[PDB]
C-alpha positions as a LaTeX table, in Angstrom:
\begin{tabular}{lrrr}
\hline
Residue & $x$ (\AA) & $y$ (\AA) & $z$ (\AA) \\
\hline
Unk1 & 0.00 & 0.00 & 0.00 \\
Unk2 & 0.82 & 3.66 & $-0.48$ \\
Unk3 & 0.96 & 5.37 & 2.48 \\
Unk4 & 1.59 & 8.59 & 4.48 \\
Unk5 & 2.73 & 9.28 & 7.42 \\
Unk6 & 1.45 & 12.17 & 9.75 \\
Unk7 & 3.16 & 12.01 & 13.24 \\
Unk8 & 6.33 & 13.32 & 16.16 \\
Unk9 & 7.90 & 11.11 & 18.05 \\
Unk10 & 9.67 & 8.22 & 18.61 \\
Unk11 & 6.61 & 5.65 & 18.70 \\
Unk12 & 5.78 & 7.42 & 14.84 \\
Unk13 & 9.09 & 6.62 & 13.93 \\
Unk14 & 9.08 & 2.97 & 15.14 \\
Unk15 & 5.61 & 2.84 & 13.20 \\
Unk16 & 6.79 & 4.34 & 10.02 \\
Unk17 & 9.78 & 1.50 & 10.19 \\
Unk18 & 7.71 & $-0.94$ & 11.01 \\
Unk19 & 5.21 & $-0.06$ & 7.74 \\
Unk20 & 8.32 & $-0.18$ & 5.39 \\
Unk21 & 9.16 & $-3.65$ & 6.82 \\
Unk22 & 5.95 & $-4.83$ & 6.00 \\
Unk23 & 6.06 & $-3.62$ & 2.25 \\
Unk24 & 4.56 & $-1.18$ & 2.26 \\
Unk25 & 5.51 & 1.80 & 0.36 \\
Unk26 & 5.79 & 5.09 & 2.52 \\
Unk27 & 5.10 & 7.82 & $-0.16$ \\
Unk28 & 5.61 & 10.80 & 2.54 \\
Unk29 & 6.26 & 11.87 & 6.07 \\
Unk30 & 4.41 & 14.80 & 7.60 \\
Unk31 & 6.15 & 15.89 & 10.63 \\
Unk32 & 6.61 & 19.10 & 12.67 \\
Unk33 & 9.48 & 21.58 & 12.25 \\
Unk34 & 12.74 & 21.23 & 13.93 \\
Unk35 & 12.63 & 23.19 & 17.34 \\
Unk36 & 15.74 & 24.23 & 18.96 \\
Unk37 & 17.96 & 22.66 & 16.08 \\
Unk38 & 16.71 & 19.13 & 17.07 \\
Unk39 & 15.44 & 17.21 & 14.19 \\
Unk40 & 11.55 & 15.48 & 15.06 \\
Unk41 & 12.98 & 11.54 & 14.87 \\
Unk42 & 10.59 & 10.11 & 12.18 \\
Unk43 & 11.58 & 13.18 & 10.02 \\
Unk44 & 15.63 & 12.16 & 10.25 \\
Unk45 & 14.22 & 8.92 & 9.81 \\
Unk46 & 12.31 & 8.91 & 6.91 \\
Unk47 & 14.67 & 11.96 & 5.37 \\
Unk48 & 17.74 & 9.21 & 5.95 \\
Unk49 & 15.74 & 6.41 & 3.47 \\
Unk50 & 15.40 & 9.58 & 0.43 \\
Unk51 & 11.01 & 9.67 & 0.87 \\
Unk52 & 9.76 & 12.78 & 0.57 \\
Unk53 & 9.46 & 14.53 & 4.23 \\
Unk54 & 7.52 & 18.13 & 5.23 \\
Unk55 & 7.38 & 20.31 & 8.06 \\
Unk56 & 4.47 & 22.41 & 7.66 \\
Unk57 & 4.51 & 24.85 & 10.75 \\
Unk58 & 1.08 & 25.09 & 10.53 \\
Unk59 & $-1.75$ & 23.07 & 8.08 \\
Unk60 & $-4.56$ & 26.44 & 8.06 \\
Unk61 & $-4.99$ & 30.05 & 8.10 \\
Unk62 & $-8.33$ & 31.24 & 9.23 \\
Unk63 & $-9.89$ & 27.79 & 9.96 \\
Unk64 & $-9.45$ & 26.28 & 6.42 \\
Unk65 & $-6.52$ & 24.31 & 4.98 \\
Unk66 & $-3.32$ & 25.98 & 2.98 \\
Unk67 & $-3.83$ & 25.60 & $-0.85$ \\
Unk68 & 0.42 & 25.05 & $-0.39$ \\
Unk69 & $-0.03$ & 22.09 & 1.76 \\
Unk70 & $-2.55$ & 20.51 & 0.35 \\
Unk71 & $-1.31$ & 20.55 & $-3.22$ \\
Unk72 & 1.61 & 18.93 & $-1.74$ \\
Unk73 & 0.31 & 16.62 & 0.04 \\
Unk74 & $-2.08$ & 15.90 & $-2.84$ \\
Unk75 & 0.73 & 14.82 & $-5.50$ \\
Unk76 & 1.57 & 11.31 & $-3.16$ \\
Unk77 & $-1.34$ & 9.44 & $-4.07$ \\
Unk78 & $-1.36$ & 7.83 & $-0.25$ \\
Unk79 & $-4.45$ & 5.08 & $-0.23$ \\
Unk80 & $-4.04$ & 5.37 & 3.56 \\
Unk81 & $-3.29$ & 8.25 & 6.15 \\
Unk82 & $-1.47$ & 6.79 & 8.95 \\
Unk83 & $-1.57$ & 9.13 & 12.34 \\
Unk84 & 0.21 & 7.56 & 15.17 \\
Unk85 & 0.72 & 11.16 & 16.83 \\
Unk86 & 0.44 & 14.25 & 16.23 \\
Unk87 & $-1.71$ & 16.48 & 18.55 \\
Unk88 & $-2.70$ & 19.05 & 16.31 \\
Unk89 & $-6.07$ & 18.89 & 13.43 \\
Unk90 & $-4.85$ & 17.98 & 10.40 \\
Unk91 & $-7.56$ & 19.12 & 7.52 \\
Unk92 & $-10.44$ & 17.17 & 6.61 \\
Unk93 & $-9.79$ & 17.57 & 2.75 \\
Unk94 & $-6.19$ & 15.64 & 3.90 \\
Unk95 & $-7.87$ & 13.00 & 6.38 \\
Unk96 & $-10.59$ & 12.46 & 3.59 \\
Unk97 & $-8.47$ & 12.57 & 0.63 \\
Unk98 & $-7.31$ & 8.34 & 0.15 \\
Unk99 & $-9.33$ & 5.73 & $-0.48$ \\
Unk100 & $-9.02$ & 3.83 & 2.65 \\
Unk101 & $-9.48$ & 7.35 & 4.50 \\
Unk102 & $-7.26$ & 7.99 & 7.95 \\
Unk103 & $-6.00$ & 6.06 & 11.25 \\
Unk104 & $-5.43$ & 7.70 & 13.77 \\
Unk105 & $-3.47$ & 5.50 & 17.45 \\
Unk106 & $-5.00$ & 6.32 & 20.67 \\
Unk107 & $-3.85$ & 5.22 & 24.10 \\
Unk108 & $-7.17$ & 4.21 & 25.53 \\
Unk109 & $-9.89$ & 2.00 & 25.18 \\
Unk110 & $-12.41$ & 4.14 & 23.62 \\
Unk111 & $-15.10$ & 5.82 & 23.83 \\
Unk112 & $-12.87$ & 6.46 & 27.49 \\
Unk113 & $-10.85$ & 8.86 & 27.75 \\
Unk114 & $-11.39$ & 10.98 & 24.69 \\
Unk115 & $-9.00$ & 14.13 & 24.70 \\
Unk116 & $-4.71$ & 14.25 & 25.06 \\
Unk117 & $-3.88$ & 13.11 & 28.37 \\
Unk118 & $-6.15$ & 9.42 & 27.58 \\
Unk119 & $-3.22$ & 7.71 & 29.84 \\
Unk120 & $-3.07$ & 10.21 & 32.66 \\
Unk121 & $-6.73$ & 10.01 & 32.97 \\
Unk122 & $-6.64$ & 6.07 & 33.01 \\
Unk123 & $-4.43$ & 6.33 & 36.23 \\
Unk124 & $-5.94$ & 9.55 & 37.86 \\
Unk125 & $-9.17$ & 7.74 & 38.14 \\
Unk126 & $-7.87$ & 3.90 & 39.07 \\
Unk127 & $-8.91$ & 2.57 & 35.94 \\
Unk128 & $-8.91$ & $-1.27$ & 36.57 \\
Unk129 & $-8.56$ & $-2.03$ & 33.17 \\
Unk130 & $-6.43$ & $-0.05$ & 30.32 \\
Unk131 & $-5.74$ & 0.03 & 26.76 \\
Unk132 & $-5.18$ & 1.70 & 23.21 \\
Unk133 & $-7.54$ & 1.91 & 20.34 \\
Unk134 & $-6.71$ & 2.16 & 16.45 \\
Unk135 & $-9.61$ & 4.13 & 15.04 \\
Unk136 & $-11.12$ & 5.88 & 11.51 \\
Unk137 & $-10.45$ & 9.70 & 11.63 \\
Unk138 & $-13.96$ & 11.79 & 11.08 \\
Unk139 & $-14.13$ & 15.55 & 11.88 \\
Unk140 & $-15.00$ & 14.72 & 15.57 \\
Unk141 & $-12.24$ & 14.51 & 18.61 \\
Unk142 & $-11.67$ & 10.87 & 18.91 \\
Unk143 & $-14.86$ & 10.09 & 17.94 \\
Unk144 & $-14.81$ & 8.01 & 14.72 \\
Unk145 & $-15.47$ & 4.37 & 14.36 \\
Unk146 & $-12.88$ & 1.66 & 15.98 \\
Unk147 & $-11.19$ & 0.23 & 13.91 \\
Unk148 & $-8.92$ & $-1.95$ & 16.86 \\
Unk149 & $-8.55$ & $-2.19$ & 20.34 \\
Unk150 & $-6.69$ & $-3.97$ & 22.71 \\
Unk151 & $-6.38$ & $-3.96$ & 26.18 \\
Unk152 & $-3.84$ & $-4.96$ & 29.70 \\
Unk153 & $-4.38$ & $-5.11$ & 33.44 \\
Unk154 & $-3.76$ & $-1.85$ & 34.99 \\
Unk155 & $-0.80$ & $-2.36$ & 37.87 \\
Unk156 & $-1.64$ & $-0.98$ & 41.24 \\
Unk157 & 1.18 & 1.02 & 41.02 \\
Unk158 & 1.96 & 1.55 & 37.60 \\
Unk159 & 2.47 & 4.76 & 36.33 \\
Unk160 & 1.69 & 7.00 & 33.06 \\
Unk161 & 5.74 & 5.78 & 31.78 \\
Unk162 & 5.63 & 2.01 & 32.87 \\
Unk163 & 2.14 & 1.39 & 31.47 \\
Unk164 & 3.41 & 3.09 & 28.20 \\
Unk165 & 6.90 & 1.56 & 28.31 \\
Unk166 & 5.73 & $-2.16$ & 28.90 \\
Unk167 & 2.44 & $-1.95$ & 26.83 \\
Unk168 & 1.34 & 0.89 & 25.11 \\
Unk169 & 4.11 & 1.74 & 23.37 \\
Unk170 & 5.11 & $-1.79$ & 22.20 \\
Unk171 & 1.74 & $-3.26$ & 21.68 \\
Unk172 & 0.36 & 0.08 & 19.88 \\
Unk173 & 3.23 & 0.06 & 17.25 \\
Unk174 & 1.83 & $-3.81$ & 16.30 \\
Unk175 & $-1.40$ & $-2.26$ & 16.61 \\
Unk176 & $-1.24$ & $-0.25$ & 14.27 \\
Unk177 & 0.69 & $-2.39$ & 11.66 \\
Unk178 & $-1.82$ & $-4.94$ & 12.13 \\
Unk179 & $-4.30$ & $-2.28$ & 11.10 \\
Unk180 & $-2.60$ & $-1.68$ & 8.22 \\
Unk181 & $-1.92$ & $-5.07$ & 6.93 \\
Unk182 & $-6.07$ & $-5.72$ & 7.95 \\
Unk183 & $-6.74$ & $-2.78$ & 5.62 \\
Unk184 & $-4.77$ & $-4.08$ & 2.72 \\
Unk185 & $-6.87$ & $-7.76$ & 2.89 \\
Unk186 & $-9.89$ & $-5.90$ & 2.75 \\
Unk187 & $-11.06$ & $-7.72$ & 6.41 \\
Unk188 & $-10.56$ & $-4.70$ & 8.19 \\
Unk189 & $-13.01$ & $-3.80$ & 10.61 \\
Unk190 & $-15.38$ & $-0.91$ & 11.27 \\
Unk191 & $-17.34$ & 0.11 & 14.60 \\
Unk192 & $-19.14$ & 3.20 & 15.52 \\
Unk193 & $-17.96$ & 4.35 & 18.87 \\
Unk194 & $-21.44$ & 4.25 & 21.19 \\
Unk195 & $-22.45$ & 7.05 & 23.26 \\
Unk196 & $-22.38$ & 4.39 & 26.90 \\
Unk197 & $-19.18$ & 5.11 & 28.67 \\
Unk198 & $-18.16$ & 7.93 & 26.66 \\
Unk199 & $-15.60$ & 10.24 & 28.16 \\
Unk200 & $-13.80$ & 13.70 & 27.10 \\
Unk201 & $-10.74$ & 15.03 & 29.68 \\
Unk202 & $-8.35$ & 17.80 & 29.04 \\
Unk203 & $-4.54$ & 18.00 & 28.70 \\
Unk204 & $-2.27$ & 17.13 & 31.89 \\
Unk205 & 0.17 & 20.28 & 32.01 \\
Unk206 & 2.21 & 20.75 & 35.31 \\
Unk207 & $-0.30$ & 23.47 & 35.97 \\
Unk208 & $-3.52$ & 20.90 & 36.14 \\
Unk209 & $-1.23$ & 18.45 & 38.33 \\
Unk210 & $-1.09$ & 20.21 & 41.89 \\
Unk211 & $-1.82$ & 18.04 & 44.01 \\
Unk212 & $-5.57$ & 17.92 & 46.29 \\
Unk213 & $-4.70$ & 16.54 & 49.37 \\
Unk214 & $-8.58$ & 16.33 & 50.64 \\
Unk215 & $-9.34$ & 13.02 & 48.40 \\
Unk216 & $-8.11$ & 9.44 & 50.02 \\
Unk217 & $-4.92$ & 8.34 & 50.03 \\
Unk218 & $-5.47$ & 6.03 & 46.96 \\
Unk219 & $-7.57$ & 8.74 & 44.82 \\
Unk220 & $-3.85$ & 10.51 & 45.77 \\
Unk221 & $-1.89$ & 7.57 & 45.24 \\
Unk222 & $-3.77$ & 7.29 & 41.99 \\
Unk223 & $-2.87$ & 11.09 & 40.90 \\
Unk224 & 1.07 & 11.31 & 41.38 \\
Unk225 & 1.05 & 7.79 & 39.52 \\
Unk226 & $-1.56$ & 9.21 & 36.50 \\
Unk227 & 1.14 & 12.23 & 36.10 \\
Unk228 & 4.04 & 10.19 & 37.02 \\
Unk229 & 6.82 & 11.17 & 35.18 \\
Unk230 & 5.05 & 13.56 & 32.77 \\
Unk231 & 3.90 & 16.33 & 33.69 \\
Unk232 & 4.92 & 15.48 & 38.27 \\
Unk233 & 2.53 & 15.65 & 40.42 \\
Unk234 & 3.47 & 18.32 & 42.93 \\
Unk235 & 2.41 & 20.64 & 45.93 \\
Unk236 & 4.00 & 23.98 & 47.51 \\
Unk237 & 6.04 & 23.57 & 50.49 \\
Unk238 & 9.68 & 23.90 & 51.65 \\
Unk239 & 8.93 & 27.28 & 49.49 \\
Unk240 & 8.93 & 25.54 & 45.99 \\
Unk241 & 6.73 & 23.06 & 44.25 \\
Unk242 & 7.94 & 19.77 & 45.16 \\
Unk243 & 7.42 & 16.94 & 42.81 \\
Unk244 & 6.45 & 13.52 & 43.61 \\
Unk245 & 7.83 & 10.02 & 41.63 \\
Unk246 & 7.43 & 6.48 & 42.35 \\
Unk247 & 4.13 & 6.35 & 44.54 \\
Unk248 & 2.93 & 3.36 & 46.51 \\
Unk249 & 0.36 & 1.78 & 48.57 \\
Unk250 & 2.41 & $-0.88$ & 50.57 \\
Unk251 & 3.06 & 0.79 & 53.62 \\
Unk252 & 2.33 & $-2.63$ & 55.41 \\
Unk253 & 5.68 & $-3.39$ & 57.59 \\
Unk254 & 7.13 & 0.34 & 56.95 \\
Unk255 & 8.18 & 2.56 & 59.89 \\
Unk256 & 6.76 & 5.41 & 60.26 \\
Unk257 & 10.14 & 7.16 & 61.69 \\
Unk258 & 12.64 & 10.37 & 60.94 \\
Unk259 & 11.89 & 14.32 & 60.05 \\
Unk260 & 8.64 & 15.14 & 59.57 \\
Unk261 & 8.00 & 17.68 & 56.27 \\
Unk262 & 5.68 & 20.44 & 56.60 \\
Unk263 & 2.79 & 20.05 & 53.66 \\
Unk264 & 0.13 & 22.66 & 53.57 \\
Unk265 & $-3.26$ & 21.36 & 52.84 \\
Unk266 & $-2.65$ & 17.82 & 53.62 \\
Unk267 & $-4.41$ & 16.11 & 56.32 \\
Unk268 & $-1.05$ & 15.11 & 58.42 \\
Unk269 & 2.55 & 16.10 & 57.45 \\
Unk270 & 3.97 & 13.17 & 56.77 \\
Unk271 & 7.51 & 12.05 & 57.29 \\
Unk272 & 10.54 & 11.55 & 55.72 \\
Unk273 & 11.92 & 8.02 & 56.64 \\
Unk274 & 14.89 & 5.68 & 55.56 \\
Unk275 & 12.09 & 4.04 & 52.52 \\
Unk276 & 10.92 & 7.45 & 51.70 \\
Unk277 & 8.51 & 10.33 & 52.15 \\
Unk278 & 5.15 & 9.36 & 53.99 \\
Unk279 & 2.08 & 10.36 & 52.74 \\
Unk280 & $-1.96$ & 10.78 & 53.94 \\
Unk281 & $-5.31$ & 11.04 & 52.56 \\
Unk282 & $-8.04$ & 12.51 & 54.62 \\
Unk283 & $-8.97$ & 9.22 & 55.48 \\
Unk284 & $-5.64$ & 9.04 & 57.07 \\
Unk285 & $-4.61$ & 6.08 & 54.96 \\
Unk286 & $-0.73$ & 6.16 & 53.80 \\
Unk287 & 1.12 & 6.36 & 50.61 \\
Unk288 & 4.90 & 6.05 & 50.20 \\
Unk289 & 6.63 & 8.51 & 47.61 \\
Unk290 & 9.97 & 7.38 & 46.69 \\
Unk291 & 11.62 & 10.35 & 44.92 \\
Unk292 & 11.73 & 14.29 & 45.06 \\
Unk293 & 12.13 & 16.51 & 42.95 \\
Unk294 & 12.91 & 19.88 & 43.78 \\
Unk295 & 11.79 & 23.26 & 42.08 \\
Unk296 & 15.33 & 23.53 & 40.91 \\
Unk297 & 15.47 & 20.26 & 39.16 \\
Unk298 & 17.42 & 18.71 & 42.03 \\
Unk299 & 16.21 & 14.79 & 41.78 \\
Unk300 & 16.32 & 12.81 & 44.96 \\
Unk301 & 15.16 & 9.40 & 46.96 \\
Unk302 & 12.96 & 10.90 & 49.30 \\
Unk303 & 14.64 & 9.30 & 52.09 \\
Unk304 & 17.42 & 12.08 & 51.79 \\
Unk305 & 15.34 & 14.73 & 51.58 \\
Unk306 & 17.25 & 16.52 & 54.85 \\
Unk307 & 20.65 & 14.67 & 53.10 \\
\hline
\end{tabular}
């Protein structure tokens, strides 16, 4: 199949590999500019193997699509649109324009979790169960028909990075091939997303990830893990925002020993022992945070928080 390629990062480069291995024939790359003199790594990618690559800073002026991009993008003749990520609306006249339309990799088991953060919100709200969904694009915000989904146990303490690392990432790039190679057999699947379960959530920036320290100790628990590593879930004291990595549950057998460090807002202080910092819900349950960061970017084992 002819296809093109509309992503960032690493997990879009892997993909884009991954298609060529197949057989597939990638007829272009659409990628975002290079920021800071650092090269996107599916552009260098794809620029390295000589197909055609572009770095359109933006796809529309005044809510419709450049006539310059889209006579470009035109001239492949892609059958498929293949969007493994890349956070920003590409046009409708692009997602429309193959025969075999767009497909577009999300990290969650849709219709949850709708919106940029699908992981984050997985963890934040103790999602049992988690997952990523292959989908068709339509001019709705992860809204179009499944196309595959698969899904994994969620960990009780895994966080945003392990879940990705050790399932989302790996499984989603076969995902997505998979989608591809059911597309070219003509057995691919198609499956309106239902209204029943249905859930939109905003973007995790550090600014949405301060911590509430009137919720349970799980519900917090479940929070530093749900922003754990991106964006750090964090809370003023000690005069800075500290940030909080590595959360836990199993206090069972822990001592409870050592400095205790000052939180405003949270139901007890909570203490700084030789396993880490000590945490409470106002249900007075504990957590165990296992490394600091400070404001400064000083990272830490909480244990040596006072050195």
């Amino acid at each position: 199949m002819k296809i093109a390629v509309i992503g960032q990062s690493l997990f879009g480069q892997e993909v884009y590999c991954q298609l060529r291995k197949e057989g597939h024939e990638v007829v272009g790359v659409f990628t975002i500019p290079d920021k800071d003199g650092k090269a996107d790594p599916d552009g260098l990618e794809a620029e390295k193997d000589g197909v055609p690559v572009f770095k359109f800073p933006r796809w529309r002026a005044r809510g419709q699509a450049l006539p310059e991009v889209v006579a470009k993008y035109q001239a492949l003749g892609a059958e498929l649109n293949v969007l493994p990520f890349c956070s920003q609306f590409i046009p409708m006249e692009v997602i429309n324009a193959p025969r075999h339309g767009s497909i577009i990799y999300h990290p969650s088991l849709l219709p949850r979790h709708r919106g940029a953060s699908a992981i984050n919100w997985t963890l934040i709200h103790g999602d049992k169960k988690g997952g990523f969904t292959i989908f068709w694009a339509d001019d709705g915000l992860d809204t179009g028909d499944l196309l595959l989904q698969k899904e994994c146990e969620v960990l009780p303490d895994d966080t945003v990075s392990t879940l990705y690392n050790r399932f989302l990432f790996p499984e989603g790039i076969k995902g997505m091939v998979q989608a591809v190679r059911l597309i070219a057999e003509g057995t691919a699947p198609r499956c309106p997303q239902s209204e029943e379960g249905a859930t939109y959530e905003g973007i995790q920036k550090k600014e949405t990830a301060k911590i509430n320290w009137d919720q349970p100790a799980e519900a917090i628990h479940n929070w530093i893990r749900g922003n754990d590593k991106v964006p750090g879930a964090w809370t003023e004291a000690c005069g800075q925002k500290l940030t909080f990595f590595n959360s836990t549950l199993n206090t069972s057998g822990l001592s409870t020993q050592g400095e205790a460090l000052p939180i405003p807002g949270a139901h007890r202080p909570g203490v700084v022992t030789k396993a880490g910092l000590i945490l409470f819900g106002n249900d007075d349950r504990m957590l165990l945070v296992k490394n600091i960061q400070l404001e400064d970017g000083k990272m830490m084992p909480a244990s040596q928080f006072f050195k």
